[PDB]
Structure formats: C-alpha cells, structure tokens
C-alpha cells in the first residue's frame with residue numbers, strides 16, 4: 142500500500158526541521174521529503190542562492206554552459222573520483238544517463254552484445270521504464286508492456302550470486318551502496334569490494350546509485366568514500382539541490398568519451414546545489430551528522446527499552462532504519478500515521494521498517510522534541 | 525557554443541564579456557516569458573521563502589492551484605506533475621500501456637509513433653522517438669513500438685489493430701523540421717484511436733503552453749487527445765512538467781499528483797500570464813513580424829524554400845543549395861549577436877519569448893539578416 146497524506150494534512154510552510162500544515166499544526170520533520178531537504182526547509186543560504194541567481198539567469202539549454210554549472214562541476218570533480226559531470230533534473234534522469242552510458246560504453250569499446258546489467262532485489266532506481274526495470278521490485282515494473290531486456294536481478298549482498306551471473310557479456314553492475322527503500326540495508330564491505338573486483342575482471346562498469354545515500358547522508362560526502370570502493374559511474378540527486386530538483390551523473394573522461402568537463406545543468410538549480418555543496422562538504426557538518434545520528438539512535442533505543450518494538454537499528458549517518466519486531470510486522474505505516482498525529486514526520490522502508498532521513502543540520506532541540514513526539518506515537522500504537 | 529550566457533532580461537542576454545544578444549531561441553522554446561520576468565521572479569522568491577519541497581506523499585497549495593488552472597482550461601480532469609518533458613512522457617507512455625493492460629488485455633501493447641519524432645532521451649522515450657540514430661547503441665530497447673511517417677494517415681491505419689494501446693504524436697514536430705500535422709491527419713488519429721480502443725497521446729512539451737497562439741495546439745486543431753504532456757514553457761525556465769488526462773484513464777494508476785511547490789508556484793504565475801486573451805493575441809501579431817522579416821531576408825538573399833510552424837514556433841527551411849548548413853547560419857547568427865535554433869541540418873528554427881518586444885524582433889532579425897549576408901557573401 143502506498144502512503145498518502147489525507148486532505149487534512151497539506152504542508153504549507155517549512156522552516157528548518159519544522160513544517161506547518163493548512164490548519165497551522167506544527168510538525169518536526171524527520172523525513173526530509175524522503176531524504177531531499179538535507180539542509181532543512183528554506184535554509185537561508187539556499188534561499189539566498191535561489192533569489193540572487195533568480196534575478197540573473199534561470200535557464201540555458203544543453204547547447205550552453207553557465208557559471209553556476211561550471212562552478213558546481215568543478216566542486217564535484219575536485220571532491221570526488223569524477224573527471225566529468227552531467228547535470229539533469231532528477232535522480233531518475235541521472236540513472237537513465239548512467240545506465241545508457243554503461244550500455245553505450247560497452248557497445249562502442251567492446252561489443253554490441255555486451256549488454257547484461259546486474260542489479261539487486263529490492264533496489265530502487267526511479268520510475269521511468271528503464272530505471273524501474275533495473276529496480277528490483279517486480280510489482281513496480283510489471284504492467285507497462287515490454288521491459289527493456291538483459292537485466293538480471295540477484296539478492297543484495299549476495300556476492301556468490303553476482304559471480305554466478307556475471308560474464309564477458311556483462312556491461313554493468315548497478316547498486317545502491319545502502320538500499321534506502323529496500324529496508325535501509327547497507328552493503329557489506331566484502332560485497333561492495335567484490336563488485337569492484339568482478340567488474341574489473343569482466344570489463345564491466347560499476348555504477349553506484351547514490352541518489353539517496355549521497356551528498357552527506359552517510360556522514361561522508363558520498364557513501365563510496367565510507368566504503369573506500371571507487372565506482373566507474375555515480376549518480377546523485379535529492380540532497381544535491383536541498384529541495385530544488387537537480388541531479389548529477391559523475392564519471393571519468395575515459396568513460397564519458399563514449400558519449401569541457403561539465404554538460405547541462407540549470408543555472409538556478411546549480412546555484413542552489415553549489416550553496417548546498419559548500420555547506421555539506423565541510424568538516425563541521427560531516428562530523429555533526431555522526432553526532433546527530435547517535436542522538437537519534439539513543440532515542441530509538443530508549444523507545445525500544447520502554448515499548449519493545451524494534452529488532453534492529455541500522456543505516457549510516459542520518460539515514461536511519463529501525464526494523465520492527467515480528468509482533469509488529471507490517472505496521473510501519475501505522476507508526477508513520479501515529480507519528481503524524483503526534484506532530485512528527487517519519488518514513489517507512491517497506492512495511493516492516495521505520496526510516497528517518499532528517500536535515501543533516503537538524504537542531505538538537507528538534508531531535509529531542511521530535512523523538513519525544515515519536516515516543517508518544519509509539520505509545521498510542523502499542524498501548 | 526562559443527559564449528557563456530551570464531545574465532538575461534526579457535529577450536536580451538549578456539555573455540561574460542558583456543556582449544548583448546537577442547534571444548530568438550528561448551533555450552529551445554523554454555523561456556516563453558523571456559529571462560527573469562518580474563512576475564516569475566516574484567513567484568519564485570515568495571514561494572522560495574515559504575516551502576520548496578514536498579514528496580509525492582503530499583500535495584501542496586501551488587500544485588493544487590496549478591492543477592485547478594490546467595483542469596479548468598483544458599480537457600483534463602487529472603494532472604500529474606514531474607520535472608521534465610522526458611519524465612512527463614515516460615508517465616504518459618507508461619499510463620497508456622498500463623491502462624491498456626488492466627482495462628483491455630496484457631497483450632494490447634503496440635505504440636504507434638512517427639519518424640522524426642522527439643519525445644525525450646530516456647531509453648523508453650527515445651525509443652518512442654523517431655530518430656534511430658539517437659536510440660541505437662544502448663542495448664535492448666523497450667519493444668512494441670512501430671514508427672510510420674509523420675502525416676501519413678494511411679500508414680497509421682495499416683499498422684493499427686486491437687493490440688494497439690496508443691498513438692503518440694507531436695501536433696507539431698519541433699525538432700523534426702518544424703512540421704505541423706494536417707487537420708485530416710490529426711482528426712484521423714482520433715478516429716482510429718476510437719476504433720481500436722487506443723489512447724491518443726499528444727506530446728505538447730514544445731508546442732504547448734501558448735507556443736502556437738492557443739494555450740495548447742490541440743485547441744488550434746480542435747482534436748481532443750486522451751493524454752497530453754506539457755513542459756518547457758510551463759515553467760518559463762524552471763524545470764516542471766505535467767501529464768494531463770481524464771479521471772477514467774488516471775484511475776488505472778484528489779485531482780493532482782506530485783508537483784514541486786516552488787516549480788508549481790512559478791508555473792502558476794506563467795500560466796496566469798500566457799492564458800490571457802492579450803498574450804495569446806500578441807503571439808500571432810509577433811509571428812507575422814518574424815515572418816515578414818524572414819520573407820525580406822529571402823527576397824534579398826534567396827536562402828529559404830519554406831517558412832512554416834505555428835504561432836511563435838517558426839521554421840525556415842533552407843533551399844537545396846544550403847541544405848545541411850543550418851549550423852552555419854546558427855553560428856553566423858551568434859557572431860552577429862542573435863541566438864537562433866536549428867531543426868535538423870536543413871531548417872532554421874525560432875522559438876522566442878511569447879512576449880518578445882517588437883523592438884527586439886526587429887533588432888534580432890536585422891542581426892540575423894547580417895549573419896545571412898555574411899554567409900552568402902561567402
């Protein structure tokens with residue numbers, strides 16, 4: 142079942158980690174619009190970037206570059222393995238470009254028959270026909286007519302299964318370093334390094350979808366940096382624009398040459414993403430993400446001590462998953478709705494897992510107040 | 525291109541050296557109210573202080589208001605918002621497929637589309653697009669897409685059957701040489717879709733939101749599609765898009781779905797201006813100003829075989845002597861200080877602001893005449 146807000150919960154205003162609806166009810170936001178508003182609502186630096194670029198230039202076509210795109214590209218190139226950056230609007234679009242690029246690179250550099258894409262059960266990569274087919278939930282890709290072929294799914298974290306299906310006809314392995322929608326499941330170190338080794342062996346490209354786990358979410362700028370495994374292609378969105386739709390596909394010159402250092406990028410979007418990048422990619426903010434994770438986790442542990450609802454607390458940085466015990470299997474939506482009644486916005490990650498993806502700069506006072514509200518909601522659900 | 529735009533106001537653009545250009549390209553028919561239009565800047569700033577983002581779990585006031593405006597003004601009863609034309613087309617094509625699957629048969633999957641069509645660059649949309657060069661080389665394409673020539677109603681009749689789920693068409697093919705559907709072709713598509721229980725999908729990403737001098741091209745033609753997509757002009761430069769359909773069709777998936785609050789506030793302001801008698805009338809006045817200049821340029825330099833399009837989507841096809849050289853005129857245009865487009869290597873394309881000042885039409889077309897003069901003087 143999808144989760145939709147009823148007619149009496151329409152957000153009208155946000156500031157920091159607080160949201161107000163049409164009736165003026167105030168909520169603490171631990172959801173971030175699904176890990177998008179990584180610097181909270183109407184952050185003054187992002188508002189300033191939006192307004193100043195908004196007076197100057199909003200739009201160029203892909204025929205032109207613009208100063209905000211150039212500056213953002215340079216920032217991303219300097220901070221990561223990337224040598225080339227392509228900007229788009231959404232994570233779905235960035236993933237489309239990544240997957241097409243892996244396919245095309247294989248086609249032109251090796252063979253038109255080198256087409257297999259390996260992906261993982263419960264993966265989420267977007268809702269376009271190609272991306273949802275690479276995604277690992279057949280319920281979401283069924284019912285749209287013929288899917289793009291040569292996509293093979295195996296279980297996340299099953300390196301043996303990857304080894305078994307990979308071959309010289311394989312062009313890519315596509316993986317979320319942490320599967321956000323798929324129960325907040327993190328890759329193990331041996332699995333992710335194994336993917337890098339298998340891609341090297343088969344001359345396939347390793348594609349990291351960091352749309353959800355990138356741009357500071359894990360407490361490193363990108364999850365790949367936490368793991369110390371470098372992909373061939375990486376995608377980023379959501380937190381990248383802090384609520385403004387923007388995305389990026391990062392790769393090397395060698396790979397991008399199959400298709401300056403940057404291509405595309407809406408001037409307004411890139412100005413906002415530049416401001417977001419400048420704040421997130423700091424020692425102070427990245428350290429604070431770790432401090433804040435532990436504040437949330439301690440609250441979740443306290444709730445569990447009182448109410449006995451969780452079997453596991455997991456995730457990385459400020460992507461937090463809390464798996465419900467068997468006695469509460471399927472109840473994630475109910476805790477989410479009770480949370481909203483109590484004035485706190487949370488997420489699910491499937492029907493058995495609570496998910497939290499607050500602003501990376503969420504104030505300690507908001508953590509405590511929001512988690513008190515969530516405790517109150519838990520009390521109502523399990524009374 | 526050989527310059528970097530840094531600032532725009534209306535239909536004038538400045539580069540890093542402060543060189544002033546006249547913009548007849550609109551970032552490819554996107555900045556339909558020109559650069560930094562004060563109403564759009566005001567909407568951006570006001571919503572930008574209030575709320576930028578909601579997930580698809582929620583709606584928001586700008587999305588509800590924009591949905592209402594589009595529903596009241598068009599055949600639509602339901603509106604789904606996305607970021608780009610590509611995303612809106614993905615949603616439209618998936619919806620046509622899914623509707624056929626659940627309302628008729630899982631085997632009802634054929635999509636009919638047209639040679640030279642452009643629908644976006646995602647794997648699915650580029651495969652529905654009609655330029656094999658752009659869909660080749662990405663591995664297995666989504667199947668059950670058949671292409672026939674644009675404007676060939678006989679060919680559509682021949683390929684359509686009970687296993688057909690959709691006909692996808694741009695009422696005017698912008699990228700494909702600025703070719704307009706004939707009335708009998710477009711009406712014919714509606715009749716064949718009715719006969720075969722298929723959905724007629726109009727891609728109005730380029731020709732919609734006032735571009736033709738009607739709010740949507742379907743209104744010009746008087747042929748109502750089942751699904752329509754809109755983007756580009758809809759946000760005036762802010763990335764936003766919409767898929768418009770009926771309740772009966774949308775139910776295969778309240779009245780709106782999705783929509784970025786900031787994007788929808790900007791698009792609401794854009795909609796309010798474009799959907800006015802005066803702006804829509806002006807589009808026709810201005811088209812004739814452009815066309816008169818193109819005619820005078822042809823009288824002096826003898827370079828065009830045809831001037832076509834609708835409203836402020838203008839195509840000027842080059843004579844056989846200049847075939848393949850549209851890029852040469854585009855570059856000479858830029859040197860002369862005017863930003864124009866191509867529509868393939870044989871066609872010049874113009875897609876200026878719908879409110880482009882007459883002074884800018886005359887100045888930009890004088891610069892374009894200079895560019896043409898330079899190219900022809902050899």
Ligand SMILES: Cc1ncc(COP(=O)(O)O)c(/C=N/OCC[C@H](N)C(=O)O)c1O
Nearest residue numbers: 175231232233265266267268352353378580
């Ligand atoms: C790992 C990962 N990859 C790709 C995407 C798609 O990015 P988007 O198009 O920017 O939403 C996402 C986006 N998730 O957003 C929640 C889902 C969304 N509400 C939807 O179903 O479209 C993601 O988490």
Ligand SMILES: Cc1ncc(COP(=O)(O)O)c(/C=N/OCC[C@H](N)C(=O)O)c1O
Nearest residue numbers: 552608609610642643644645727729730755
């Ligand atoms: C009829 C029609 N349908 C869909 C699209 C795609 O819209 P977009 O994703 O908003 O660019 C377009 C976009 N055209 O943009 C011009 C070319 C484009 N920038 C490219 O190179 O992909 C269109 O004209």
Ligand code: NA
Nearest residue numbers: 218221222223
């Ligand atoms: Na680098």
Ligand code: NA
Nearest residue numbers: 595598599600
């Ligand atoms: Na209507």
